[PDB]
Amino acid sequence: LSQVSFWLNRESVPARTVFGVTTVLTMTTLSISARNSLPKVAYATAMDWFIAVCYAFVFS
């Protein structure tokens, strides 16, 4: 849904802005809800790396 924001034309700014912001918010809440299931451990799991990479993709 975030990478979809590239096929919209360059004149429609609010649409692409909404895409970007809502995808970043969804990634934040997904990271939180994924860390909630596990014990409060002090290292990084595999799911954490996947969510970090997806966050990097939406932010990029």
Partner 1 sequence: GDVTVILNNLLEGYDNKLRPDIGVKPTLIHTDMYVNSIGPVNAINMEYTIDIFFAQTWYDRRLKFNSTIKVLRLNSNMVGKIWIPDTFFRNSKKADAHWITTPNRMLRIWNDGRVLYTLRLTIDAECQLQLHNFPMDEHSCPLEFSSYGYPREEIVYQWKRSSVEVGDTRSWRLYQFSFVGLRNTTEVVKTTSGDYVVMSVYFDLSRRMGYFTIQTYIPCTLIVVLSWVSFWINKDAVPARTSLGITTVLTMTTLSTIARKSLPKVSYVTAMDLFVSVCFIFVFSALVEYGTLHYFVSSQPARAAKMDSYARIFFPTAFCLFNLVYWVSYLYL
Partner 2 sequence: SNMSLVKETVDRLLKGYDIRLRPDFGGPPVAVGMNIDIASIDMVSEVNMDYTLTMYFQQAWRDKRLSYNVIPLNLTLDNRVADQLWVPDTYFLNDKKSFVHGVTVKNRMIRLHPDGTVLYGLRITTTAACMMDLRRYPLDEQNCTLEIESYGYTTDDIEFYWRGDDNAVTGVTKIELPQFSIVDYKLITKKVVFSTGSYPRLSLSFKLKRNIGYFILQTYMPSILITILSWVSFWINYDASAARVALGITTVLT
Binding positions: 7
Within 9-28, the residues that bind partner 2 by CB under 8 A are: 9, 11-15, 17-19, 21-22, 24-26, 28
DSSP the chain: --GGGGSS-TT-HHHHHHHHHHHHHHHHHHHHHHHHHS---SS--HHHHHHHHHHHHHH-
Residues lying near partner 1 in the complex (CB under 8 A) are found at 13-14, 16-18, 20-22, 24-25, 28, 31-32, 35, 39-44, 48, 55, 59
Interface with a second copy (CB under 8 A): 14, 38-39, 41, 43, 45-47
